[PDB]
Amino acid sequence: LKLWEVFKDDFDIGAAVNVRTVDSAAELLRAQYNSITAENEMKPINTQPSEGVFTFEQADKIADFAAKHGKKLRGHTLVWHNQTPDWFFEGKETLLRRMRDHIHAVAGRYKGRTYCWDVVNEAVADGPEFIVRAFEYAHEADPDALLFYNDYNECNPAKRDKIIRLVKWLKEQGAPIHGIGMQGHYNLASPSIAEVREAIEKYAELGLVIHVTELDMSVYAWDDRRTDLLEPTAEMVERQAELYEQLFSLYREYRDVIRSVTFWGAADDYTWLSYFPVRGRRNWPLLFDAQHRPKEAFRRVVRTA
Ligand SMILES: O[C@@H]1[C@@H](O)[C@H](O)OC[C@H]1O
Structure with missing residues (x-):
């Protein structure tokens, strides 16, 4: 049995x-x-x-x-605050010019293959006119691609409202934004299912496509920084499988607005959570283990469909 085929009429099943x-x-x-x-x-x-x-x-x-x-x-991705080259900053118009040149070269190189773009990544802090023009240059470079704004902690009520305010303002300036990207960097302790449902409802009210772009389920809460675990406990696996089952049941409820769900990884043998925030630590946040065999979360997730 194959994950994508199980949800093929619900949404894409992607992997970073x-x-x-x-x-x-x-x-x-x-x-x-x-x-x-x-x-x-x-x-x-x-x-x-x-x-x-x-x-x-x-x-x-x-x-x-x-x-x-x-x-x-x-x-993923055209504009990002954290990883912008130093040479980019070496006038506001020269910044616009360099942003337009980069977008055209990258979105043009993969036009016909990249069907969408995270145009602006993580602009809301845990000026604004740059985001409008980034979407304009992206639609100029590829009029066929769907243009997304991508951010994390999207279910936190404070950051969620800022994201919604940003997107509505972008829509009110004529920015060709077509979807919002829910990064989905979740864990066992946070967020709750109701907090994800409340966020999906408020994001759907903007009339845009919803992509879950970087989904994973950390076994450690963000505070937990221990390094003594080489394998997850049974309750870790069980609670992860339960949250994944409720997440994909919720995603199927919003079938009509969610078009793609991408995990930030393919299997537990490599995850960015193994190096952030704690370097050299191990985490097991996906649906397949380090041998690319389905986990208990896989069994529960496919039973939702
Ligand atoms: O690409 C970024 C990734 O490195 C991180 O895991 O979550 C945010 C993304 O934008």
Whole structure:
């Protein structure tokens, strides 16, 4: 049984990949996912290290994998506060010009393969006119791609309201924004199911597509920073499987607005949570274990459909 096929009429089932996991998880990706996202290779510093110098080799590899095996391809990401090259800042108009040049080169290179784009990533703090123009330059570079705003902690009521205020203002300035990206970086302690449902309802009221873009279920609460666990406990697996079952049952309720659910990883053998916030720690946040075998969460999730 294959995850994507189980939910094929509900939403895409995607996985984030890098230049390593696109090879090590090749068989798992070919079978269980129908959508792929480049984890880091399409980010600004990895695509244009200096002005006028573009490095597409690593992102080309991930894009070629998707095209070869008929996988959909999410674009991530065109503009991001945390990882903007230092040369970008070395006048406000020159910044606009460099943003337009970068967007056209990256969105143009993968036009016809990237069907969507996280145009602006994490603009809300845990000026605003730059976000409108980023969407304008993106729609100019690829009029066929769906343009998303992507952010985390999207179910926290404080940050959620800021996100909604930002998107409505963007819509009121004529920005060609088509969807919102719920990053879905959750854990066992937070957020609750009701907090996710309340967020999905308020995000659907804007008339945009909803993508769950980077979903994972950390076993540690953000406070927990222990490093003495090499495998998850039975209750960790059980509570993770229960939350995943309720999450995908909730996603199916909003079938009509959610069009794709992407995990930030393919299997537990590589997850970014193993290096953030605690480096050298182990985490088990996906539906397949370190051997690309289905976990208890997989069994419970497919039974929701
Ligand atoms: O690509 C970013 C990723 O590194 C992190 O895991 O969550 C936020 C994303 O934008």
